[PDB]
């Protein structure tokens, strides 16, 4: 089973350097564009970091960022490691 890679690459330091009150352009600049967004009603940037090497199971960090109406006040919801 070949190596399955999914999502955008994340690191401790790059995931730490986003805080409430940032505009959409800086977070995009510091982490790249989101590979998946929410096309239903709201707008929330989903940063999933899923990788699954063969016969080892998954490691996945999910970075879900929910905006205000105007692309400020980034609530930061972090679910570090799945269960």
């Amino acid at each position: 089973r070949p190596d399955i890679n999914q999502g955008n690459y994340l690191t401790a330091n790059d995931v730490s350097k986003i805080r409430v009150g940032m505009t959409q352009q800086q977070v995009a600049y510091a982490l790249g564009t989101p590979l998946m967004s929410d096309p239903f009603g709201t707008n929330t940037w989903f940063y999933v970091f899923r990788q699954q090497p063969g016969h080892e199971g998954v490691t996945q960090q999910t970075l879900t960022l929910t905006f205000n109406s105007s692309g400020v006040l980034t609530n930061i919801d972090n679910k570090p490691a799945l269960s």
Binding site: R1, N5, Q6, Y9, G32, T33
Partner: protein, 758 residues
């Protein structure tokens, strides 16, 4: 002058309206000579007319005119070195083309123009003469006579300033010539434009890689002896000193990939400046930064020259932009093969970080299949995002699949039918189905094979085949018997690595033999297991039920599936008979194909082919003869008949010359592949040298003395000759001329072969 009417004379193609539109003066206008002159030179400025006269009739203003002659033909005569159509292409662009007209003042300019072209390509004696033939209805045919000028030799190339490297070595490493050898008539003493720049570039590179830091070509001169019979190319160069190398520096944003960079950028103190090494280290650091997502970096390498120590240090300024994520992987070209198989062979997924070698492994895997002619990966970026990239693939199909099917039924004769069909993409689904069918009147051969290379998505492949064949012997009474064999096989194969495959399966084989005249080999097999048949009497029978199990290991690593130019292939298959059968044996056979190129074009390739295989029974049982190994014929070892190498049977009353094959076979071929500079591919011509050997490991020599003892394989056969291979829409075909220089008494030789091969 009051103009109450405008009247025309001489108009033919140009209608009244165009002329009338063109004129400043109009009906009802009051006109002076000025307004008439303007009108005249207005009419002249439309490109439609040759001579014009605007005169005053009693009340009317009369415009007289003669239109330009309409080109009906453009013919070319004497133009050895220029295509008529291309020459036409330039001409339609410049202005002259059929349907339009001829300015009789420009023929000179046409001539001078083409002549100018010819001057600007070397032939200063070139003369282009335009003959203009009139036809009725103001028509014209213009024939251009082209006369190539006397060839002007490129007499010499001179390099002034050099002190360490001789001139004739630089001309031996140029492309332009001054003295072509009389024994090498492949090149001429020619002169072009881009070849001069190429020579300057190769001289600069040959001086920059030897270790010279400061070096600059000053100017180039192109002289001409004053009859257009010779050209002199003179370069004036200078060279400072031979320099050394001190140390490399690294600076920029590179995201922690520093250890491997420091490891690969090492240089020996005491080594000197190099020209191709700096660009090699730059292309290596670029390929390495591309192997993690940073696909479009910015790396510039300029050194700071220190002249006091005759040694220079250089820095590289890496600038890696942010990662690139694949967004869509679309395939263009696949017209009969479905989209699923190309995605299964793809190893680079979608929505992940771009691994520029993970995208190349998929290209190599698509190339090694053999369904496709050519595969190329092109990286395209969508402009609607800073960092998001698309990977596309262009494929061109290759059809190798052939229906030959025929059924013929009779009242007074048995039904006859011929059927040959094999396919490695049934409907592009991915299967391989194959059926062969022959029944003339006595033989009957039928087999059906279907296999699936992806029964899961990981690569676990299963397939099976079914076969039945039997024939009556009474067509040629030479060591032939009544053979009846029906059998079904079910094979399952899975990969354990990204290269290596394994496969297991069960098989039922039923063999029925009858009407075999006595020779001692088959009886040596009968005497061990079976009965005691009557020594000089025919019409004996023997049936066998077999439950075979087979294992196989494969190493496939090539570039193309049919004409491989790199890598090697290993194949090992072997079957063993399980307890609960009639005979009990094991067979082991091993294929090996090795390809090595010598150049960087991958045109001249060495080809080594190796085949080994071994058979033995279990517990006194003696390895049924009908399953034995035959060598000989094309594609096993060339320059012999089919199935002629090995031992030769010993008939009971006591000697004849029919070959029956043996237990143990060793074959190795060495082939050198050479190109063919005539074909625009599908052809491949090679020279081949190859050795074949088959023997039998149970031939007692205590009985027989004059009968040839086979068990000591020093009787190695050999062959040589030329082989040309070519693929057809019928299928892959091969025919080879072979002359066996070492042969043995009994080898039924032949010197021309043609079969499927591959």
């Amino acid at each position: 002058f009051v103009v109450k009417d405008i009247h025309f004379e001489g108009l033919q193609r140009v209608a009244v309206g165009a002329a009338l539109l063109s004129m400043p003066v109009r009906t009802g206008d009051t006109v002076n000579d000025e307004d008439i002159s303007n009108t005249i030179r207005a009419l002249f400025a439309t490109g439609n007319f040759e001579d014009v006269r605007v005169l005053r009739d009693g009340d009317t203003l009369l415009v007289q005119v003669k239109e330009r002659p309409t080109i009906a033909s453009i013919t070319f005569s004497g133009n050895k070195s220029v295509k008529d159509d291309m020459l036409k292409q330039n001409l339609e662009a410049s202005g002259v083309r059929v349907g339009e007209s001829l300015d009789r003042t420009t023929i000179a300019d046409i001539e001078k123009g083409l002549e100018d072209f010819y001057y600007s390509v070397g032939k200063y004696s070139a003369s282009v003469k335009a003959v203009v033939t009139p036809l009725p209805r103001n028509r014209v045919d213009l024939k251009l006579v082209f006369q190539e000028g006397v060839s002007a030799e490129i007499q010499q190339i001179n390099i002034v300033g050099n002190h360490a490297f001789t001139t004739d070595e630089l001309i031996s490493h140029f492309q332009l010539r001054d003295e072509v050898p009389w024994w090498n008539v492949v090149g001429d003493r020619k002169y072009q434009k881009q070849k001069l720049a190429g020579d300057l570039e190769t001289l600069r590179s040959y001086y920059l890689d030897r270790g010279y830091a400061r070096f600059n070509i000053d100017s180039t001169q192109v002289s001409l002896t004053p009859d257009k019979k010779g050209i002199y190319v003179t370069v004036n160069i200078t060279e400072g000193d031979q320099y050394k190398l001190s140390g490399v520096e690294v600076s920029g944003n590179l995201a922690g990939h520093s250890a491997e960079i420091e490891q690969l950028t090492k240089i020996e103190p005491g080594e000197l400046y190099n020209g191709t090494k700096v660009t090699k280290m730059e292309d290596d650091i670029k390929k390495l930064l591309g192997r993690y997502g940073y696909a479009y970096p910015r790396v510039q390498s300029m050194p700071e020259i220190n002249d006091a120590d005759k040694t220079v240090k250089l820095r590289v300024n890496v600038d890696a932009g942010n990662r690139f994520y694949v967004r869509k992987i679309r395939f263009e070209g696949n017209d009969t093969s479905k989209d699923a198989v190309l995605r299964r062979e793809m190893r680079q997924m979608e929505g992940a970080w771009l691994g520029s070698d993970l995208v190349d492994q998929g290209k190599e895997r698509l190339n090694r299949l053999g369904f496709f002619e050519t595969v190329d990966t092109d990286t395209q970026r969508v402009p609607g995002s800073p960092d998001q990239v698309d990977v596309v693939y262009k494929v061109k199909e290759r059809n190798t699949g052939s229906f030959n099917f025929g059924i013929g039924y009779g009242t007074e004769s048995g039904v006859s039918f011929q059927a040959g069909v094999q396919q490695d993409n049934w409907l592009g689904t991915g299967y391989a189905v194959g059926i062969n069918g022959t029944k003339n009147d006595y033989q009957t051969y039928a087999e059906l094979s279907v296999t699936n290379p992806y029964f899961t998505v990981d690569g676990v492949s299963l397939g099976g085949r079914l076969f039945y064949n039997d024939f009556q012997a009474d067509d040629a009474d030479l060591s032939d018997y009544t053979n009846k064999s029906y059998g079904t096989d079910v094979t399952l194969g899975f990969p354990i690595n990204e290269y290596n495959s394994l496969r297991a399966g069960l098989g039922y084989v039923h063999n029925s033999l009858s009407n075999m005249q006595p020779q001692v080999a088959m009886w040596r097999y009968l005497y061990s297991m079976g009965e005691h048949p009557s020594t000089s009497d025919q019409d004996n029978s023997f049936k066998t039920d077999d439950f075979t199990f087979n294992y196989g290991w494969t190493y496939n690593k090539l570039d193309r599936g049919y004409f491989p130019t790199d890598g090697s292939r290993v194949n090992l298959t072997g079957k063993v008979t399980i307890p609960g059968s009639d005979n009990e044996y094991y067979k082991v056979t091993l294929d090996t194909a090795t390809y090595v190129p010598i150049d960087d074009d991958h045109k001249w390739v060495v080809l080594g082919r190796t085949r080994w295989g071994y058979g033995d029974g279990l517990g006194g049982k003696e390895m049924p003869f009908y399953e034995n190994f035959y060598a000989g014929g094309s594609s096993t070892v060339r320059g012999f008949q089919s199935n002629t190498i090995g031992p030769k049977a010993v008939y009971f009353p006591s000697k004849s010359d029919d070959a029956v094959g043996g237990n143990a076979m060793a074959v190795a071929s060495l082939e050198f592949i050479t190109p063919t500079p005539f074909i625009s591919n599908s052809v491949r011509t090679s020279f081949f040298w190859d050795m074949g050997t088959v023997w039998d490991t149970n031939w007692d020599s205590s009985q027989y003395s004059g009968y040839p003892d086979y068990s000591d394989p020093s009787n190695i056969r050999m062959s040589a000759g030329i082989a040309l291979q070519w693929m057809s829409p019928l299928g892959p075909l091969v025919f080879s001329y072979a002359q066996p220089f070492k042969k043995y008494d009994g080898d039924k030789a032949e010197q021309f072969q043609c079969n499927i091969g591959k």
